[PDB]
Design a protein around this nucleic acid. Sequence first.
RNA 1: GGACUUAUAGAUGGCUAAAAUCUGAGUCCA
Lengths: 548, 568
Amino acid sequence: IHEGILFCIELSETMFKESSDLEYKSPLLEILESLDELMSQLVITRPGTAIGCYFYYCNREDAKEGIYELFPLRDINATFMKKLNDLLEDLSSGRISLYDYFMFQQTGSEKQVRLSVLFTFMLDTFLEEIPGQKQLSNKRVFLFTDIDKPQEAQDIDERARLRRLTIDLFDNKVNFATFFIGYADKPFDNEFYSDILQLGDSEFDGPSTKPIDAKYIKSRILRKKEVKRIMFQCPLILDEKTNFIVGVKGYTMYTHEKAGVRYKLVYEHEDIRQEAYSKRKFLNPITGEDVTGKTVKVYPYGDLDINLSDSQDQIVMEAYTQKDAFLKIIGFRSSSKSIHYFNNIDKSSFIVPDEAKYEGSIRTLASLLKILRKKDKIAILWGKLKSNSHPSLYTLSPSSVKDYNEGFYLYRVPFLDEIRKFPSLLSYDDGSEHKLDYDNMKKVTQSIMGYFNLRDGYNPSDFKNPLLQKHYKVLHDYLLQIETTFDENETPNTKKDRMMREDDSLRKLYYIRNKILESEKSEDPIIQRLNKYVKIWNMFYKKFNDDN
Amino acid sequence: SSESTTFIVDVSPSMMKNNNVSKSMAYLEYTLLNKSKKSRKTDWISCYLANCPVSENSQEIPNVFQIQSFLAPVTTTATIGFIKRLKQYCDQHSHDSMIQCLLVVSLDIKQQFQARKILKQIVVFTDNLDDLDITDEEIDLLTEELSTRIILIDCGSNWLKLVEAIPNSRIYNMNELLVEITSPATSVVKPVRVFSGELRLGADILSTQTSNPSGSMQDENCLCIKVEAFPATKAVSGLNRKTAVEVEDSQKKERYVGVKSIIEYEIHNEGGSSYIPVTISKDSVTKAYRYGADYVVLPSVLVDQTVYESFPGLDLRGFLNREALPRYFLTSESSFITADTRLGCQSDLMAFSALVDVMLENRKIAVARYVSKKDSEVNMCALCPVLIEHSNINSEKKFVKSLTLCRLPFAEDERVTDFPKLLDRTTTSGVPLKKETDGHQIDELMEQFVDSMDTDELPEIPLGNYYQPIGEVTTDTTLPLPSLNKDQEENKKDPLRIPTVFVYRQQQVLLEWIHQLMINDSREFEIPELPDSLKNKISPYTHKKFDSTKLVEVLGIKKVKRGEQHSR
RNA sequence: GGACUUAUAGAUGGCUAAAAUCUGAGUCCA
């Protein structure tokens, strides 16, 4: 319900120097920018998230024991967001540098933090009780460091005390997400951090201390930023006779975020400002009486209404479903007869074994995953994900080997009545009769189509919802009294750039036309091809209407 | 548009003892009750009796009985009445108990509808088609006077003469109807345009993203096809239900009246005890949007700024191979994209089909930007090419080229995180977990388990037949008749295209509710079984018999304050 | 504004979702 992330970043010489793996941008700068994006995303996606950011060892006068506080662990808010935004802008303008802000020096021998103080700080931070802030259900520490071997690596007894500091955190449900940074030249030896972050029982033995290249920092942050939102859990029946019943969990991989769904209602009357509520009130059309909570649902059947008892409702559903959520295997089938791109009706779920409900679940699905991959088969499922819903046929497909997450994807199959009819046309003459002219049109289309292949496929990351971005930007600017930059006296060029700024998709569309437009200007006969293809296509379009 | 249907039931001693009148009654009951739900103003029903001891009709002809007058609209209560009139007649003449009848009906139709544009039909239930004498002088007489088609039903060459003469007349069996009204039937929903605009490649952003009709059609640097959008898949939630309260009346059956609802607004004055709700006006209520830990009421002019001004269009972003697009990216219901020969010219249908054809041959999917209306949601979508077979005038097959539109996710939509490995499992730190003992026997038995339920023997729907043209399901009359389509039947063995079970179940139960409690006057409802035909479609398929008892054993399966949060 | 058809219909809603809410939608006549 309420997760909190504690950013802890270790300062060093290589953290300040621009890296070729980062398009010549500082790792420290990359972490800051990643943090700006994180809060920008979560304020839309999961605003009930607490974020705090700390640096060490910092030589600033306002640093306690060498640990500087950018902002404390608080729920995401425009005030902290502005603080970071202003810092990044002070950097961009050349008003200050990163060295100037954190009071760092290129001496080759700056002070370093005592890890004892650091791990104790993390524990104290998550134990604080802040009045206006809710209790945290999930506590995590994003640990960024560049030093493989700190000073405390030589002292064996220091490691021992550190190991109980780490355990002390694990006992308080505080988990580590490590960001141990290695470069092309300098690699990260995780030998030290392995020792102190390890546990002594089988499953949980601490976090991964495997280092990462700086090139993967931003992506790693924004990936581990998200939280598993459990959509449903139910038994998976494989064969009921032999009690071949197993447990599974389902997660929504792709939601449908809409702007303006997050709101409260305020009632203000003179000096009274108070929260208001919407109340749906049912009336009797004959008397005007409030019959709320005294209404019933019936089946209309002509000039007759039919109300069944709960006992009868039970018997009716009993013929094809259970009360609680379930998934029953109807059979298996080739993926090429089961999965299509033209009959989706719902959003997909990601299915994972639930061995907390049924032991042996992991062994079952791991084998089923291996087998269904080997034969390229899928499972046909019958059931429902919620108690209060209708059942349906589902497709259970094994995760690809290219994907990192190992499990299954669940696709709902449309009922026969969910498959709508194709509309009748006024004409059916598509010009297929004239073989040569039609075959030419396909050929020129095929060539035009070649100039616009998506070599990196489709990535959701590249397309921000413009509706969402517009909505939260207006809220953002109003809270911080940022005056709008929109001008009614817009130049077509001004308007053009605004459009591409507000919509990631329009920016792409702009490139496509431009490539066609720079294909006619160009006098290189090779580059010249694209635009001439388009002209030929239009020639066929106009020729067809002049003839048929 | 409008039609009339006249039912005639033979009451010979053969029809009674062979239980052929009770069968036809079951058809009449199903037919009329379903008609009652629509209560169409232009759908007429009327019934007569043949070879009947009762003689009551307009022309005062013996052995003819108009048991039910011309009725429109057909209501549920009226259907209850008609069936009970017949049920009483059927029970009386159980143990102890035609040519001119067809002539009386024709006269009663000419006086009822006169010359109005109405599709008239006569439906006849009888046995012994051979045992009946209708002279050529009577057939010569029957064809001239009649402007009404004939539907004959055999309950067990002479009868053929009438059917062959009268235009568009057919002959069916009794059990042919008794099986049709038993089997599930997909509802025919007439396709309705949900979008009308342009499919564009290389269009000007300044020209398209305005409310101006800036024709990209005249842009020779742009691929511009006029297209329409229809719904391809749409979710159903069963029979629509009515919110109601119960009322009393002189004849206390379960009598209900519909209710309406309003939205009221209240504040809570708390007195940890409970609060005192007080109704307040909407005028003193404002929406406060959330931004992190703060809530914001915007001035009216800024509340307009929040809405992103979007403009109707479909703009191509690029192309990729089918396998390049992860299937789980598809998040919404699907829609058809067809060429617009209505508002556009015939070049659109040609150019559009050429595009789809190329996408089919190269197995390509298009990524596009979609906006249906002004200020509507902006969507990233996948455009998948499809074929749709149409019944053609020529002996050759006809495939209509089309596209399927389905929404792709934005950045803010993905909830993906790192999940624990399932195959090569490790600890949280990442050290390789010890490989499971009895591992080879598990994968071996699981493989047999998957083969045991192999449904590949069950055929996928033929190419270009998953979707179906609206024309191939439209018929002349609204009477439940056998499909007559040879390809449509037993295409129902596709295990991934099954009837909407919970809807059928609803209709099945409501029919028996009416039959038992309203017509038979029983006071106990006997809810029928779900047909084995439909049960099988949601039951485990067995290809080869297999005992998973060993598999289960080795797997080891065992069950275990907001008033200051306002800011600025 | 009417007639007809559709209710397994046409839409909305949303802290990501209620066995919720509304009556809409298409065609033809003035």
